[PDB]
Amino acid sequence: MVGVTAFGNFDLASLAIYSFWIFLAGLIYYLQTENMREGYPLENEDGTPAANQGPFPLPKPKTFILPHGRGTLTVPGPESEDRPIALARTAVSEGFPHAPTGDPMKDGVGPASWVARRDLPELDGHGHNKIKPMKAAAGFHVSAGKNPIGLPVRGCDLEIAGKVVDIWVDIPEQMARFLEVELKDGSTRLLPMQMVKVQSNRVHVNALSSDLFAGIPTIKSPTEVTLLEEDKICGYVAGGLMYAAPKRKSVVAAMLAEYA
Amino acid sequence: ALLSFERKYRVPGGTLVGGNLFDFWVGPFYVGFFGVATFFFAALGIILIAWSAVLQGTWNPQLISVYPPALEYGLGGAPLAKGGLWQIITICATGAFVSWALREVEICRKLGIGYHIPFAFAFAILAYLTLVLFRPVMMGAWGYAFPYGIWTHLDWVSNTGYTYGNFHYNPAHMIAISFFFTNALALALHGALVLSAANPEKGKEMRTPDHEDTFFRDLVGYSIGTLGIHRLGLLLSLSAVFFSALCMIITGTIWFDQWVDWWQWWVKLPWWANIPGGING
Amino acid sequence: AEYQNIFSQVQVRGPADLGMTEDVNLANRSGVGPFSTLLGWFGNAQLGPIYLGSLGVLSLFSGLMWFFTIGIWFWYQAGWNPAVFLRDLFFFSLEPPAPEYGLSFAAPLKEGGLWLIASFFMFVAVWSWWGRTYLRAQALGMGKHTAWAFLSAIWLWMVLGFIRPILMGSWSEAVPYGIFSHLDWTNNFSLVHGNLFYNPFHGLSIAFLYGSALLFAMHGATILAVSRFGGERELEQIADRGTAAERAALFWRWTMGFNATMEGIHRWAIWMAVLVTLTGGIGILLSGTVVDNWYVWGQNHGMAPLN
Numbered sequence: 116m117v118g119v120t121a122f123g124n125f126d127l128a129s130l131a132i133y134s135f136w137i138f139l140a141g142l143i144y145y146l147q148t149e150n151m152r153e154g155y156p157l158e159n160e161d162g163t164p165a166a167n168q169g170p171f172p173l174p175k176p177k178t179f180i181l182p183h184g185r186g187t188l189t190v191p192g193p194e195s196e197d198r199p200i201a202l203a204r205t206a207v208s209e210g211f212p213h214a215p216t217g218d219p220m221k222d223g224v225g226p227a228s229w230v231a232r233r234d235l236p237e238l239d240g241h242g243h244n245k246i247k248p249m250k251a252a253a254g255f256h257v258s259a260g261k262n263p264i265g266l267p268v269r270g271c272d273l274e275i276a277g278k279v280v281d282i283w284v285d286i287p288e289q290m291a292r293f294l295e296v297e298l299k300d301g302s303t304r305l306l307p308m309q310m311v312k313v314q315s316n317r318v319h320v321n322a323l324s325s326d327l328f329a330g331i332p333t334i335k336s337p338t339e340v341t342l343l344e345e346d347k348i349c350g351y352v353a354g355g356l357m358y359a360a361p362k363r364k365s366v367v368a369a370m371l372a373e374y375a
Numbered sequence: 376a377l378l379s380f381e382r383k384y385r386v387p388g389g390t391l392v393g394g395n396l397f398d399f400w401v402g403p404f405y406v407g408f409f410g411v412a413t414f415f416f417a418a419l420g421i422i423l424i425a426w427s428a429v430l431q432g433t434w435n436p437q438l439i440s441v442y443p444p445a446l447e448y449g450l451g452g453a454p455l456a457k458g459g460l461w462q463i464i465t466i467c468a469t470g471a472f473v474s475w476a477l478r479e480v481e482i483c484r485k486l487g488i489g490y491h492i493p494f495a496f497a498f499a500i501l502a503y504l505t506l507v508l509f510r511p512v513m514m515g516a517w518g519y520a521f522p523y524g525i526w527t528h529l530d531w532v533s534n535t536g537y538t539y540g541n542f543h544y545n546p547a548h549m550i551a552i553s554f555f556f557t558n559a560l561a562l563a564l565h566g567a568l569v570l571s572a573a574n575p576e577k578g579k580e581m582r583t584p585d586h587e588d589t590f591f592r593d594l595v596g597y598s599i600g601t602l603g604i605h606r607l608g609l610l611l612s613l614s615a616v617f618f619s620a621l622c623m624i625i626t627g628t629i630w631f632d633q634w635v636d637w638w639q640w641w642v643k644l645p646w647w648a649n650i651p652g653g654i655n656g
Numbered sequence: 657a658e659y660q661n662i663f664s665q666v667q668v669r670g671p672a673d674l675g676m677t678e679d680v681n682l683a684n685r686s687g688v689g690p691f692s693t694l695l696g697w698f699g700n701a702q703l704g705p706i707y708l709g710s711l712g713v714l715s716l717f718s719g720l721m722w723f724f725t726i727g728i729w730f731w732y733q734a735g736w737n738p739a740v741f742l743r744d745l746f747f748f749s750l751e752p753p754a755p756e757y758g759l760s761f762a763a764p765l766k767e768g769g770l771w772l773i774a775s776f777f778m779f780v781a782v783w784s785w786w787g788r789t790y791l792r793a794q795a796l797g798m799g800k801h802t803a804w805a806f807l808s809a810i811w812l813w814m815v816l817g818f819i820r821p822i823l824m825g826s827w828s829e830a831v832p833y834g835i836f837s838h839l840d841w842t843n844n845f846s847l848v849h850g851n852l853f854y855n856p857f858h859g860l861s862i863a864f865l866y867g868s869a870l871l872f873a874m875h876g877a878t879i880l881a882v883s884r885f886g887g888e889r890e891l892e893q894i895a896d897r898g899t900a901a902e903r904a905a906l907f908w909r910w911t912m913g914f915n916a917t918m919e920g921i922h923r924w925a926i927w928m929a930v931l932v933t934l935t936g937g938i939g940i941l942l943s944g945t946v947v948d949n950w951y952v953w954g955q956n957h958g959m960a961p962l963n
């Protein structure tokens with residue numbers, strides 16, 4: 116016959132849960148403001164600060180020390196695109212799309228967008244270039260799957276745009292990142308590995324018709340690629356899904372349908 | 376208002392229905408045909424729930440509960456106050472979720488990104504449908520579905536589970552649970568690993584993915600890598616829900632007795648069924 | 657069909673990767689294991705090296721001893737018969753001392769003492785493993801987030817096997833070592849405390865467990881969706897935001913009205929996961945020590961402070 120709880124210790128538990136909700140409100144505030152370290156303050160469509168920034172204030176800045184003498188990054192910090200954006204309003208009020216003023220693939224807007232990232236290669240923990248053509252990566256070779264090197268490369272118009280001449284590999288992560296494709300004029304381009312289908316007789320690229328391969332952004336040194344160059348290449352390729360759709364839906368509709 | 380980097384992505388195109396008619400935003404939200412459809416379904420659903428609350432005679436969110444038709448109605452319609460609201464609300468919920476996934480697809484197409492997100496969401500929608508549609512249809516009555524109420528739906532899981540003894544004994548449930556636990560473990564480790572690299576010891580330079588691999592190799596002798604971990608989190612969470620839907624779709628249909636007795640199949644294998652000793656001899 | 661990046665199309669291999677050195681004692685690292693082409697379809701092909709060291713050996717030895725203490729008792733329950741061992745594998749159970757022994761170490765080997773021994777080895781294995789998550793991060797100059805997250809899992813484990821039993825006044829309260837029997841223990845725990853789904857900390861633990869599948873499905877799918885822009889190179893996207901991190905943020909902003917960053921998503925991640933066992937441990941620590949019956953509690957603190 117011993118038990119000292121009945122009079123007011125189920126209060127504890129009430130205390131605990133009440134405390135938890137207070138803690139959780141605090142946590143969500145912390146997390147949301149942590150997640151405002153990029154892209155804020157919000158802007159009007161003309162790039163000026165928006166009047167309504169929401170109920171959460173910007174966090175105090177933090178600084179990342181970057182390795183290999185690359186400096187630091189402090190965020191939140193001044194935001195700017197640092198590149199021309201070739202788009203114009205299509206309506207007289209906010210919230211409508213912005214039409215490309217030129218060729219959106221060439222101009223790098225919409226799904227063809229790129230970010231003005233640093234024009235230096237990503238580096239591994241030893242300060243060497245993270246990504247290298249396999250011919251220059253000592254000891255690296257295809258270890259499984261069909262080796263794409265030497266295969267013709269086909270675009271979504273079902274025409275051959277070139278031939279694979281190498282694989283660019285991530286050295287520290289031991290993975291394939293790009294295929295290097297040589298074009299009809301003898302120059303090469305990089306294609307993201309995520310955007311190609313390696314088949315037994317060919318590499319197929321659904322994102323681009325063959326005529327758009329020459330427009331893929333080129334790299335300035337043939338044995339390295341900078342973060343800026345990767346953004347431009349990947350943005351352009353993915354942009355083909357929307358912008359080469361005329362040259363894809365025309366073909367894969369005249370390819371099938373013949374009976375009636 | 377727009378994120379600072381947002382304008383260059385707000386181009387026309389990517390819609391699946393309606394061309395440019397609904398190709399616009401409201402504040403941060405993209406609309407599209409399916410944004411309109413979601414709004415319509417969600418609004419109607421919420422209104423009908425509010426009506427069910429009135430018929431029930433309460434506005435307390437902890438008391439409001441919308442029930443499917445009693446079992447006597449089988450798979451037919453029911454009067455509104457007697458299960459019909461549940462049925463219409465369920466059609467609205469389904470319209471709203473499916474519209475939400477298809478609006479996500481329009482957003483993928485505008486942004487030139489893969490479709491992995493709404494593909495993943497479609498697993499959640501299929502688990503919901505297993506419980507409110509697929510399983511009740513196979514069992515022959517809407518009344519086997521859960522009710523829409525904050526606490527009442529929990530009474531339904533308890534009552535449903537206890538119908539088959541300790542539901543722990545459902546083997547597809549065991550697997551689903553293992554995927555849930557393993558997913559949370561992996562989410563903790565993934566979050567922690569990226570953060571521990573991005574936020575190293577005071578005054579040290581950011582670590583690299585080389586260090587993330589090194590840390591896991593040191594710790595357990597294997598690192599799945601930065602691509603692998605996101606493949607994994609996706610696979611674990613989708614597998615959890617796949618095995619959840621499976622564990623329920625087989626329950627009350629192909630297996631309807633006490634789940635614990637299912638395991639007798641193993642104990643009763645000829646070559647050891649009759650050996651004495653142990654727990655089952 | 658477009659390629660979806662669930663499995664790699666082409667694997668590549670280079671020299672075995674011995675990893676970053678930093679402040680690690682390299683004498684305590686093994687050589688590299690084999691390379692698995694099978695694993696390499698989905699993740700890294702390389703196995704090892706692993707870090708051994710003194711704590712490592714301690715943890716492994718202690719862990720194996722926990723495992724063998726249970727397994728030896730299982731053989732005993734099988735009457736040393738291999739066929740009975742396999743038939744009844746899921747049914748054997750190493751159970752804690754009976755209530756009568758309280759918290760004493762006085763119980764006979766066959767009636768609790770062996771459970772205490774197995775538990776002791778488990779305690780050392782887990783805590784020394786925890787030290788290892790801290791020490792391996794320290795040696796590499798990294799933050800201690802893994803050790804802090806691990807501590808949250810450890811919290812529920814300690815509550816179940818150690819803290820709650822001590823507060824209740826007996827080892828009989830602890831969990832048995834067995835496949836089916838730990839499940840019976842779980843079902844019984846809920847029945848005896850008037851239905852755990854009335855425990856608000858259990859409902860929270862489940863919101864976080866489901867939220868943690870919701871969030872990993874969202875995150876894993878997002879990263880794969882933007883892997884065509886290098887999105888999985890998250891550390892570099894954090895240092896130098898790219899079109900991967902922007903398209904990911906805008907997918908969510910356009911869908912649900914707000915979004916994360918490449919760094920901050922990992923903070924939503926860490927906390928969604930750790931709160932599973934944080935709220936969990938609390939909910940079970942309160943069960944029986946301060947609240948006997950969650951249904952009864954809920955009638956007084958859920959309908960009565962709605963005042």
Ligand code: BCL
Nearest residue numbers: 499500502503532533535536541542543551552619620623
């Ligand atoms: C006494 C009760 C029984 C029990 C009986 C049952 C029963 C019955 C069921 C489960 C199910 C589950 N049980 Mg059980 N089980 C028990 C003990 C446990 C234990 C434990 C530690 O003891 C665990 C971990 C689990 C875990 C599991 C999971 C495998 C599964 C639930 C997740 C799921 O289906 O998600 C799937 C996810 C969904 C259905 C969510 C879908 C929602 C989507 C489409 C959209 C909704 C959004 C909208 C309304 C948002 C509003 C807008 C706002 C702005 C946000 N059970 C005990 C033994 N269990 C369930 C299951 O498998 O179901 C399929 C199930 O039916």
Ligand code: BCL
Nearest residue numbers: 421503521525526528532858859860862863864866867870
């Ligand atoms: C999955 C297997 C079982 C299940 C069994 C359990 C059990 C067991 C528990 C819950 C609990 C929850 N369940 Mg349930 N429940 C199921 C079906 C669902 C469905 C659905 C299919 O549409 C919904 C919307 C909910 C939602 C709810 C929340 C009230 C609560 C926290 C969930 C969560 O954070 O998840 C994770 C997702 C997120 C973190 C995103 C946030 C979304 C939440 C907060 C949405 C709330 C919507 C709710 C208020 C519906 C109103 C919609 C409006 C009318 C528009 N459940 C099926 C029947 N559910 C817990 C509880 O506390 O209940 C009292 C609990 O203990």
Ligand code: BCL
Nearest residue numbers: 809813842843845846852853858861862865936937939940
């Ligand atoms: C009939 C069953 C009861 C029930 C009774 C219980 C009980 C009892 C508990 C839960 C708990 C939980 N329940 Mg319940 N549960 C019910 C029904 C549900 C349902 C449902 C109906 O859909 C669901 C989804 C859940 C879900 C949940 C989880 C949120 C939660 C466990 C979190 C966890 O990650 O634990 C898993 C994580 C751990 C156990 C931590 C592990 C720690 C480390 C240290 C492990 C070391 C391992 C090492 C030594 C060995 C490894 C070897 C390796 C190979 C190397 N319950 C019903 C009402 N539930 C737990 C809780 O927290 O409750 C509040 C709990 O104690």
Ligand SMILES: CC[C@H]1c2cc3[nH]c4c(c3C)C(=O)[C@H](C(=O)OC)c4c3nc(cc4[nH]c(cc(n2)[C@@H]1C)c(C(C)=O)c4C)[C@@H](C)[C@@H]3CCC(=O)OC/C=C(\C)CCC[C@H](C)CCC[C@H](C)CCCC(C)C
Nearest residue numbers: 417420467468471475495496498499524525866869870873
């Ligand atoms: C498949 C793995 C996990 C998962 C994945 C997943 N969920 C997803 C997505 C993905 C990838 C999103 O893309 C989508 C999202 O936008 O996330 C923020 C979503 C989403 N998952 C959500 C909830 C959710 N997911 C859950 C779980 C899971 N989702 C799985 C575990 C759960 C659980 C576990 O209970 C819930 C509660 C939303 C936050 C969001 C979908 C939002 C949405 O469809 O909105 C459109 C519809 C409305 C705004 C309201 C509809 C109102 C109805 C017409 C009436 C309500 C009827 C309802 C049935 C009553 C329920 C009462 C309850 C008390 C039972």
Ligand SMILES: CC[C@H]1c2cc3[nH]c4c(c3C)C(=O)[C@H](C(=O)OC)c4c3nc(cc4[nH]c(cc(n2)[C@@H]1C)c(C(C)=O)c4C)[C@@H](C)[C@@H]3CCC(=O)OC/C=C(\C)CCC[C@H](C)CCC[C@H](C)CCCC(C)C
Nearest residue numbers: 556559560563715716719720781782785805806808809930
């Ligand atoms: C906070 C939420 C979740 C969580 C988090 C979490 N768990 C964690 C971590 C974190 C962040 C750690 O960093 C730690 C870890 O190192 O993970 C990799 C861990 C961990 N969580 C683990 C298990 C676990 N966690 C649980 C789940 C959860 N953990 C929660 C869902 C569960 C559940 C759900 O019941 C399990 C069972 C381990 C994998 C690891 C803790 C490891 C440990 O403490 O080890 C001690 C014991 C041993 C060293 C050996 C045990 C005996 C073995 C049978 C022998 C194996 C050795 C053998 C010789 C090797 C065989 C290979 C050979 C062929 C070479």
Ligand SMILES: COC(C)(C)C/C=C/C(C)=C/C=C/C(C)=C/C=C/C(C)=C/C=C\C=C(C)\C=C\C=C(/C)CC/C=C(\C)CCC=C(C)C
Nearest residue numbers: 726727728775776779813814816817818831833834835838
């Ligand atoms: C093939 O045969 C051999 C023998 C070779 C190998 C096979 C062995 C087998 C079959 C092993 C079987 C293992 C199984 C089934 C284990 C299952 C374990 C489970 C399901 C555990 C579940 C919960 C565990 C908990 C909550 C335990 C917590 C323990 C603690 C918190 C430790 C507390 C410490 C105590 C009480 C000791 C006190 C000592 C001091 C003073 C610190």
Ligand SMILES: CCCCCCCCCCCC[N+](C)(C)[O-]
Nearest residue numbers: 143147168169170171913914915
């Ligand atoms: C558990 C989900 C909770 C997440 C909701 C909290 C944050 C949403 C509000 C973000 C506001 C966006 N804004 C205006 C700052 O851009």
Ligand SMILES: CCCCCCCCCCCC[N+](C)(C)[O-]
Nearest residue numbers: 424436437439440441523524525
């Ligand atoms: C059909 C389920 C009932 C829907 C009720 C509306 C959801 C509101 C969430 C409950 C809020 C409870 N609270 C905090 C006010 O006490």
Ligand SMILES: CCCCCCCCCCCC[N+](C)(C)[O-]
Nearest residue numbers: 549550551553554557607611614
């Ligand atoms: C390390 C992640 C690998 C997944 C293993 C997760 C544990 C679940 C074990 C059940 C496996 C059942 N299954 C899928 C083989 O049928």
Ligand SMILES: CCCCCCCCCCCC[N+](C)(C)[O-]
Nearest residue numbers: 595596597686687688689703704
């Ligand atoms: C998820 C945990 C996986 C266990 C991976 C164990 C790999 C250890 C490799 C070390 C062996 C190297 N070797 C052969 C030189 O000794």
Ligand SMILES: CCCCCCCCCCCC[N+](C)(C)[O-]
Nearest residue numbers: 856858859860863867924927928
């Ligand atoms: C990382 C933090 C995300 C916060 C998500 C919060 C979900 C709340 C779910 C409500 C649970 C209500 N209940 C009955 C357990 O008390």
Ligand SMILES: CCCCCCCCCCCC[N+](C)(C)[O-]
Nearest residue numbers: 169401402403404912913914915
């Ligand atoms: C427990 C979570 C319940 C859902 C709460 C809804 C949060 C949605 C975020 C609001 C949308 C952001 N914004 C800028 C439009 O305010």
Ligand SMILES: [Fe+3]
Nearest residue numbers: 569875879890
């Ligand atoms: Fe990530």
